[PDB]
Amino acid sequence: GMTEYKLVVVGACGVGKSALTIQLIQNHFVDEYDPTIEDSYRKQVVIDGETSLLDILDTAGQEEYSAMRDQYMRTGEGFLLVFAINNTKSFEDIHHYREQIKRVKDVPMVLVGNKSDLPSRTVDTKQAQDLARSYGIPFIETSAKTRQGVDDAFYTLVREIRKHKEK
Numbered sequence: 552g553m554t555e556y557k558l559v560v561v562g563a564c565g566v567g568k569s570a571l572t573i574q575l576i577q578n579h580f581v582d583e584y585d586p587t588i589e590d591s592y593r594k595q596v597v598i599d600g601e602t603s604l605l606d607i608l609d610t611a612g613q614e615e616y617s618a619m620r621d622q623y624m625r626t627g628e629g630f631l632l633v634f635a636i637n638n639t640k641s642f643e644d645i646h647h648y649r650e651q652i653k654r655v656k657d658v659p660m661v662l663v664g665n666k667s668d669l670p671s672r673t674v675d676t677k678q679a680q681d682l683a684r685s686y687g688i689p690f691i692e693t694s695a696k697t698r699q700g701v702d703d704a705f706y707t708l709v710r711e712i713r714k715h716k717e718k
């Protein structure tokens with residue numbers, strides 16, 4: 552059989568939410584994608600031997616209330632909290648995005664440090680590991696540019712959802 556999963560990607564403007572989503576649904580790096588386009592995308596993959604259909608909401612546009620975004624998040628099964636490793640403000644914003652999820656939802660989440668390919672790092676991996684431990688969630692490093700860690704981010708979120716569903 553198969554299993555479907557309703558996923559959401561959040562994080563500051565410009566961290567690579569769309570780039571990560573497009574690496575998952577198209578397998579290449581799309582470096583220019585309208586920052587205002589918020590939509591859900593579907594991709595069938597196989598995770599640990601099971602056919603898995605991932606619906607992914609790539610959040611975008613004005614950071615003002617959107618009822619469709621709110622209703623999708625309220626019924627979302629898992630969330631990626633994305634920051635960019637060369638942007639300290641994006642990392643400092645993670646708590647804000649996690650609070651928004653807690654206000655609308657045990658919630659499966661994965662902390663994602665994107666843009667790992669950039670040498671201009673400002674957030675140490677150890678800093679991010681401390682934050683993910685404080686939340687009780689996994690931390691995964693990614694590069695949407697090289698595809699490093701992309702399947703790890705999404706598939707770890709699916710594995711967290713499976714654990715949650717067993718409770």
Ligand SMILES: Nc1nc2c(ncn2[C@@H]2O[C@H](COP(=O)(O)OP(=O)(O)O)[C@@H](O)[C@H]2O)c(=O)[nH]1
Pocket residue numbers: 562563564565566567568569570571581582583584585586611665666667668669693694695696697
């Ligand atoms: N070097 C590098 N650039 C990235 C990566 N992910 C995204 N980008 C770039 O970061 C910018 C914002 O990406 P985008 O996907 O639009 O971010 P979003 O606003 O979170 O959807 C664009 O210029 C992308 O080309 C990555 O992993 N590495």
Ligand SMILES: *CCC(=O)Nc1ccc(Sc2cc(Br)nc(NCCO)c2)cc1
Pocket residue numbers: 561562563564565586587610611612613614615616617620621622624651652655
């Ligand atoms: C630069 C464009 C961009 O990335 N915009 C963007 C980032 C992240 C989100 S997620 C979000 C934002 C806001 Br104001 N509120 C919520 N609340 C939960 C759902 O109602 C989520 C959106 C846009």
Ligand SMILES: [Mg+2]
Pocket residue numbers: 568569570584585586587588609610611
């Ligand atoms: Mg985008």
